[PDB]
Amino acid sequence: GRTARIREAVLLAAGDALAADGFDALDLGEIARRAGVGKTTVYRRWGTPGGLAADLLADMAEQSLPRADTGALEEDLRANARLVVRTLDDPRQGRLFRALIAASLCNEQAAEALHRFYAVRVDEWAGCVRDAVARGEVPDGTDPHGVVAAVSAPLYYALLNTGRSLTEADADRAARAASTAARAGVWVTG
Template sequence: MASANSTERRGTIRTGGRSARVRAAVYEATLLEMRQRGYAALSIEDIAVRAGVHKTTIYRRWGTKDTLLAAAMGDLVEARVPVPDTGAIETDLRAYARLIVDVLTSDAGAILVAVLFSDAARAPEIAEVKRNHFAERQRLAAPLVERAIQRGELPADTDPHELIALMAAPIYYRLLVTGEPIDHAVGDRAALAALAAAPAVRPGR
């Protein structure tokens, strides 16, 4: 099974010039084809046409559409969502929830959802990208809760991962389950609900 890192090593050469331009064009074409056609209809031939390269170039570098899609997604999810540091847990959570909404409603976010929450995620390469993406998001957001614990705003044994997941859950529920629109008001409510439930987000609870 290829990891995201091994996929990158096999699928790309991080140099400038033509190699970088080809990689960028192929990644962009892959993500656009995925968004417009869906995973089942995604083909290397169509990607090659959109990218303006020969299909043998893609087969030689990436081998399969799953390996290529995983590499393109790995490149997309490298973008960091800044973790707020406003000095108070309530405003931190609200700001972070709004950032999640902004990402999910952006063009890049639409592609992210189209790939990570579709049949594409059944492919081992894509499943690994999905696991790594959300694990990294949790890791980066943990200091938001840890700082609140240090300030005495939250109990010392508050689980950072659980609290962040509790905040994000209503946003993803509306987006993926009910299909309702998400906006900053939704993010604010999710943040306040998570903060209200914070005393229960502790070991053994």
């Protein structure tokens, strides 16, 4: 429909601008000009740069892809880690994710949406751990969220804290570390 294709264009423009210039530069009147839509429409619908980032993160969460299902926990977590590395190492996507994390640190609306995005992604990949528990590969009571969060965590710590580039070897070690600890019962609750 009309407003659906306008939203699509406005979100594309937002992702492009965030990747280019970061959250500090994101401006709704400019996104309106770039998307070719009335300034009033963009302000009315998204309100602020943080609302625009929030809705971009909503869209990203809604389109997040299903988990791998290989039959083995480590292979599943490796598929996960390698996709996160391919995403963060992409010139555009890596700059976009940095800008969206910056938005979350600057703006409470964007923070809520960023956390919801990671909740959706973790909860999807958590199905791998539920399958590993059912097949007896990891102990009963293993928290799926903790195991999955543990796979992405060192990839983001490299991105953001150490400032190192990520490699496929980093993805494999993130998955191997989490798998090893999960098998040993590290995330068995209580």
